[PDB]
Design a protein around this ligand. Structure first.
Ligand SMILES: [Ca+2]
Ligand SMILES: [Ca+2]
Ligand SMILES: [Ca+2]
Lengths: 132, 144
């Protein structure tokens, strides 16, 4: 794994925590771009191993209790009677409300390492992942 | 397939991408500061390894009307350890330097600059001088 990046055990994933300070917390979208501009992406957690890895990273750094953006994101219309949407007559720019808010998953940096979904525009620390 | 970032002059047949930095006279830098600037982005001071790469830079100069300006290039004099000779110029065969010697010769003093005119000619000058500069980045990479 790259320049000081949490080395997974059974996955080619390397994780790195980014929590340099409050004033430098980014949104989920900024966080994703940031990680992508590094040849990676926001961290995905697919097993307990990857989780302990991030937790060790949190311990070694002493980032206890801080929240982090993980690559978790959520994301058309249907007829109630089951019929298929074979026809549409939406007004200009419609539908659009179902996109005024988006939700993303953040990691709670304590022993539970639990996830919570919140507005993707909130300011958070984040965790990147980049292939070995 | 590797490509160049947010509009950085791309060298068609090579892997280098170039970008001019001439924010004006009061924003100029020294070779080292320039080198630190470029590396920070994830790139480096520009190297010109062939005519095609030179032409890429020249086109960048023309697109920004940056005519007659001087830019820092990655050109730097490294002081080869084989550079010592005797008074008459004869090469040094036998050697008996103290532990860690010689070492004062390694001081980095001279760097190269690009004259942004049609000639695209280079000149070595003191690295401490303030100039505009040019960075390069590997295709497939992204500024930071
Ligand atoms: Ca809750
Ligand atoms: Ca929630
Ligand atoms: Ca000279």
């Amino acid at each position: 794994c790259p320049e000081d990046w949490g080395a997974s055990s059974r996955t080619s994933l390397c994780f790195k925590l980014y929590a340099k300070g409050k004033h430098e917390k980014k949104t989920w979208f900024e966080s994703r771009d940031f990680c992508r501009a590094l040849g990676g992406d926001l961290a995905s957690i697919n097993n307990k191993e990857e989780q302990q890895t991030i937790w060790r990273l949190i311990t070694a750094s002493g980032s206890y209790h801080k929240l982090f953006w993980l690559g978790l994101t959520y994301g058309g219309f249907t007829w109630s009677d089951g019929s298929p949407v074979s026809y549409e007559n939406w007004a200009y720019g419609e539908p659009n409300n179902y996109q005024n808010v988006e939700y993303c998953g953040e990691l709670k940096g304590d022993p539970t390492m639990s996830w919570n979904d919140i507005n993707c525009e909130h300011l958070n620390n984040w965790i990147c992942q980049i292939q070995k």
